[PDB]
Symmetry: C3
Subunit: 491 residues, 3 copies
């Protein structure tokens, strides 16, 4: 009056953390983990400890040629990725085109070493006019000027003698060389400037075999010239030579560029500050330190990154559903300060809670392992997501978009369902575990005690603290009390 | 002789609906849902309430230029996608080429507004022959004729004077302009037609800088001309001007086209009728109203669509395995007219079936939630799947094919396995639920009744209808009958 | 002293095979299956019973034109895929270019029929020099020579008369035709060789309309010529004709090629021997006979193949966790020589183990079905993974790489997690099965026997071998022993 007791129960707490399973929405849970990265540092940072290349209002074109209003960061021998604005103000001062422009950007996205040199001195032009080739389309100190890396040759007295110049790459490294042809308005401008009326430029390497001829049209004024400049480029292998020849209309090299190229990258489209940080994932809205296997920031990322997923929350249940002294069948015990599953005894030496170290370790190690698998099994490659196509490559641009949207639709769907199914699995694990511990006890006692129905057993004998620890240890000796039990039963 | 009874059991029905799980094939089930869309309305319909553009035997080329045998639907100011046949009969009446043809189709796939206008009246040609430029390759009323949107200029008396024409876009909207060059057979035809023996066309905008020169070859007759026409096009920004100049061989604009462009789409390859319907998914074999997250019709779709999957059936088990008065251990009760899990009592006031509202709601809400997750978690973007590459882009066409086949192989595999694993999960849920309800009862009664082994309990006392409702309610008072039970037991 | 007994238990064995589940790492198991193909036969073999095309040191270019040092396998009328080395020694003997080279390789990757013919006899050149067009860049028997499939025409006496040649395809099959233009160094070489100082080649079909003009530059010596040859090609529809015309610099066809084309394939980059085998998956490190739905060899594969996955082991648990005579609660019985789950009785006729045929069949059929689903549900299409882009298509090459790496990242991740989750499912199945068999018995006996707690029941009466077989058969008659039991109990 009354007899000794032991109850099986589980942990609870004041946690309000909610989770979704394939079957139940908004399920309050004990503790849970988010696997979606949502947080960016709002800045552009190094990549594997290498600065970017941030063109403030210039453009790879304007930058290369020397657009005089491109007052930028001149000296910088290497970079990881490149950063243009949306529509950079300063591009081509004198209007025209850049042969294979995009393919060049892509090549310049990631440079190991980059040193500008001088292949044809501006002073070497003894029999042509080097310092007259100047326009009001390219203002400097309020005076007319021109691209500073490349020379507009004019006729001397009234003579454009044929130009023949070879240059030989005697550096250790490939050379990026740049020249151009002036397409003038009419045969007046043509001969006023180059005299000879039928001109041409031939350019030759061991690869190249060029022969450009000025085109005439009536064209609309752009920065007030109806003239057009069209530039070209080659890479000069490290012991080859380039040979120029020109009747006129020649925009000569002054400075070329030594490059060492080690794998690609891409141009990024951002309005952000450098932040002097490092990172391994750069986004056009900030960087990331991704432990997380998913993120939802911006799709146009560079580096080893989490998969981009259209979603706000991916939360994994790690703990339990969250809700005499009645056992598990009437809810969880707040008084289980430590341990996930365990007991509550009450005998003549007194009542306590007592955690199940063994079954609570398997449970934790299991859930820790689940969360870590879902993360460390994620194959993370270096990738650079850019927008590399002009507006006569809209078919190829549209093939790129189906691929990105296609991979988004797959990752966004499989992450959602993986959380929903693997949560339902985690909460049915917690149930299956509590109920297995009841039966661990129930099977040991048998008739030496009675199932009360609330998740406790009342004993048919004296169970002191030392008897309880045999029940929890799973070492309960029944023939040792089978008799004492038998008597208090029959009655 | 005999005692009062209560049995736990489950629903059954005459349903023959079958399902597959990861382990069991052909499993008869109570009721199940198909998640594969297989049904199309065999017609071409609007998209987001916008008509297509159905070219009956013409082609974007033939359509644009005015191939006289292209007796089509002239007036139509906007469209969503475009529809060619396989090999349209009427294309280029006079043989030749269309510069950047594919890139133009892609641009014209989706037009917000499209109004043809007249930039150069056919009557403005005072000093050249506008009405002689006619071929038997382009028959109309059985007479020789030519593309009606573009003019074949010939010499007057025996003089082709130089043409200089500027046109200025003074409309609000971009302009698609079209011209061409006649490549004739020999220097006889050349001068018979344009007189001057060395001709050229220059075309200039703020973008463009063209200079075409007729090519001569000996070429095979095609519609009986060994001549060739080669056409070109530009988009004229809304306050820019285009300037033409020509010694001869010029196919002049008459009519250009105002366009407003708002995102792309694609050309579709169908033999189908317009059906005056709306839709958000169009296929080349009909449209779809996709609640369903998968479909198996045709891969070349346009709109927000289900993922295309190579499969015939994706069926989700929603109900139960389908098979005194014996409880669950001997099968399901047909007599459970309503409810999934429940009881069958039999006492001195009589025998009935009685559904478990509470446990049967959790079950339904759970399964309803599962099916809805598998559907509403599907990220559905607008996409247009076309065939946009010529037969010198077979490498890029082959890159598109690996991507489509690649995404098919992923979706087809993950849908199959998701149904197989999530079915097995649903039927083990139904088992785990029945068996939990047995133990809900079994734990309440204890020795006040006896487990018969068939899934019933026989009572060791009088259980009237009101006692039964405490067992079903889970409010069964045991000390209230513990004594009356104890006596009828001992004996 | 003592009573008759029956125990429920499971199989064990000396197996050390380990497996990972979402929760437990390194779990010793009874037997398990690997689903990753890792084994290749180190050789290049047929595909669907068709030989490849293995160019030992030549290149599609060098091969086609007849580079004299391309001592290869001449006669071969059909092939499946093509095999170059990394940087083939013999390519273009005389330096220059091949118009649309890559697009041609792609076309020649898979040829149904391929017969070389002669369209323009070398002897037909009555008024030009056919046998003087020879260089020291193209040595043969230590003498100067030239591409053997194509003719270098020189002037006769001191006259290059105009060439006009039509050829008409009167074969059943399309024709691949090849010609070229000599770009010489200076106007001296030009007229020394072709006499006329301003030359041209026109080429015309019903498709083509060509007019090439030699270019001059000062170019670097390559195999000691600063000259350059530039070749071109067309496909001649089977009843069309090609017409050549040339003032000079013409490299004439001698031999063209009949082709029948049936779907594409790709060029492969291998250093391997032909092995006279067949296969349906060829890799650049050997072939595969893929039952397996995954492999980890090399990504650049050709045929119907397993998905390429970055992983070393994908192992599926098929058997059980691996560890009176105590029942299941104390471990597995080595003495269960046959059967997965079953019994161990002990009575007055003696003790034995006895397998549960019925429950052990469901288990095997279930696991066999799981492994087969995970394999036979894998959609396997024919695909050819190559490297088809030059180094001015690096943007398109980079779009191909994101797609491959993208599909790798998906398959590698989903296979890892599918094994981890579906293993945990398989071992919880084995538990749920043992424990259901205990309760199958426990429910049949009731008070006619006592739960010992170790997973056995001790009988409260005589159970001979025939009584045991009713318990295993599930046909145990309790009213038949309810009395005999009742007496031996009360006491
Ligand atoms: C879930 O919880 C939030 C409250 O934070 C609520 O906005 C939402 O409507 C709830 N219900 C469902 C069905 O998601
Ligand atoms: C140009 O050069 C000088 C002027 O300093 C003069 O002697 C020479 O004659 C000039 N040439 C011509 C052809 O006018
Ligand atoms: C460039 O100079 C080096 C060193 O004298 C020489 O060997 C090389 O051949 C020159 N370049 C060319 C293309 O001749
Ligand atoms: C488990 O509990 C008993 C009693 O408290 C204790 O003596 C011992 O540490 C454990 N039993 C065994 C066999 O180790
Ligand atoms: C499943 O059921 C259908 C009968 O509708 C039958 O054709 C098929 O062969 C059955 N068996 C299996 C193993 O799929
Ligand atoms: C062409 O124009 C008129 C014919 O009406 C004639 O007066 C004129 O002389 C002609 N020109 C020539 C050069 O024949
Ligand atoms: C077209 O006309 C407008 C209005 O007069 C004018 O401002 C514009 O400059 C003209 N176009 C060009 C390219 O000049
Ligand atoms: C459940 O059943 C009892 C008896 O039928 C009824 O009085 C009551 O509605 C329920 N019990 C409680 C505590 O509400
Ligand atoms: C698993 O087993 C292998 C021994 O074959 C061992 O190398 C590895 O470190 C073990 N442990 C884990 C956690 O993987
Ligand atoms: C070239 O051909 C023969 C030489 O056999 C000679 O009769 C003829 O005059 C030569 N022609 C010229 C223009 O030298
Ligand atoms: C080639 O010869 C056939 C047979 O005589 C002829 O019909 C065909 O028209 C010729 N080719 C061309 C392009 O005329
Ligand atoms: C199962 O076992 C019994 C007793 O061994 C045997 O007679 C019979 O084959 C089975 N029972 C039935 C009803 O078939």
């Amino acid at each position: 009056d009354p007899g000794d007791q032991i109850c099986i129960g589980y942990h609870a707490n004041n946690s309000t953390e909610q989770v979704d399973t394939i079957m139940e929405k908004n399920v309050t849970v004990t503790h849970a983990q988010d696997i979606l990265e949502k947080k960016h540092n709002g800045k552009l940072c190094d990549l594997d400890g290498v600065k970017p290349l941030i063109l403030r209002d210039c453009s790879v074109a304007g930058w290369l040629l020397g657009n005089p209003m491109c007052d930028e960061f001149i000296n910088v021998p290497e970079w990881s990725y490149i950063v243009e604005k949306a529509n950079p103000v300063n591009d081509l001062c004198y209007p025209g085109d850049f042969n294979d422009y995009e393919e060049l950007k892509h090549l310049l996205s990631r440079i190991n070493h980059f040193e500008k040199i001088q292949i044809i001195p501006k002073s070497s032009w003894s029999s042509h006019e080097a310092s007259l080739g100047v326009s009001s389309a390219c203002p400097y100190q309020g005076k007319s000027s021109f691209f500073r890396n490349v020379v507009w040759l004019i006729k001397k007295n009234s003579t454009y003698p044929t130009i023949k110049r070879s240059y030989n790459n005697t550096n250790q490294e490939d050379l990026l060389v740049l020249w151009g042809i002036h397409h003038p308005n009419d045969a007046a401008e043509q001969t006023k400037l180059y005299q000879n009326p039928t001109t041409y430029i031939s350019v030759g390497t061991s690869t190249l075999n060029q022969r450009l001829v000025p085109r005439i049209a009536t064209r609309s004024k752009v920065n007030g010239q109806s003239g057009r400049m069209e530039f070209f480029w080659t890479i000069l292998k490290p012991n080859d030579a380039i040979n120029f020849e020109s009747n006129g209309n020649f925009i000569a090299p002054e400075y070329a560029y030594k490059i060492v190229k080690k794998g690609d990258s891409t141009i990024m489209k951002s309005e952000l500050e450098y932040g002097n940080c490092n990172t391994k994932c750069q986004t056009p809205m900030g960087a990331i330190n991704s432990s997380m296997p998913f993120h939802n920031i911006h799709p146009l990322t560079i580096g080893e990154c989490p998969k981009y997923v259209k979603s706000n929350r991916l939360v994994l249940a790690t703990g339990l559903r969250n809700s005499a002294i009645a056992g598990f069948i009437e809810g969880g015990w707040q008084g289980m300060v430590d341990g996930w599953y365990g007991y509550h005894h009450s005998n003549e030496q007194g009542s306590g809670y007592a955690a199940d170290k063994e079954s609570t370790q398997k449970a934790i190690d299991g859930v820790t392992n689940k969360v870590n698998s879902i993360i460390d099994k994620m194959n993370t490659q270096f990738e650079a997501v850019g927008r590399e196509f002009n507006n006569l490559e809209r078919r190829i641009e549209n093939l790129n978009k189906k691929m990105e949207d296609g991979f988004l639709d797959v990752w966004t769907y499989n992450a959602e369902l993986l959380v929903l199914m693997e949560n339902e699995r985690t909460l049915d694990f917690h149930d299956s575990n509590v109920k297995n511990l009841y039966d661990k006890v129930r099977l040991q006692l048998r008739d030496n005690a009675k199932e009360l129905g609330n998740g406790c057993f009342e004993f048919y004998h004296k169970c002191d603290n030392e008897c309880m620890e045999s029940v929890r240890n799973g070492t309960y000796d029944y023939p040792q009390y089978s008799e004492e039990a038998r008597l208090k039963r029959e009655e």
